[PDB]
Design a protein around this nucleic acid. Structure first.
Ligand SMILES: [Mg+2]
Ligand SMILES: [Mg+2]
Ligand SMILES: [Mg+2]
Ligand SMILES: [Mg+2]
Length: 64
RNA sequence: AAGUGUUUAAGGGCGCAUGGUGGAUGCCUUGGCACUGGGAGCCGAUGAAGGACGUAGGAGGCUGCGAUAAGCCUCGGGG
């Protein structure tokens, strides 16, 4: 839900915070999907792609 | 009285009319076969060729991808 653009003003530690918050979110809605009370399915994909985006930006910061 | 003499179809044959089965024939094609002209002529410890297992909101196969998993970023195209 957040463009990779506005992830470049965030430092390493707060990018890491964003990433762990997102991983916790993903665990929660994975449980909700398993128990049957998640109707919105595209939420899983968006959060999974957000995690991938956060790693991508971190690696780009490391290398250049 | 003597004599003559049609009609049987359990079933079978042949001809026709009507169907079934079967998948030939005709007419085709998301497939191939033989070449022509170019390109590129190597990939691999910066882990190859090729695979295993996984991966989509729902079971499998083919495809794509690899725990960042039908995808992630940047630059162009286009709509
Ligand atoms: Mg008869
Ligand atoms: Mg050589
Ligand atoms: Mg597969
Ligand atoms: Mg573009």
């Amino acid at each position: 839900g957040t463009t990779p653009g506005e992830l470049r003003e965030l430092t390493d530690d707060e990018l890491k915070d964003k990433l762990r918050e997102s991983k916790e979110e993903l665990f929660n809605l994975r449980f909700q999907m398993a128990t049957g009370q998640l109707s919105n399915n595209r939420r899983l994909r968006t959060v999974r792609q957000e995690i991938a985006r956060v790693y991508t930006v971190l690696r780009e910061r490391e290398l250049g």
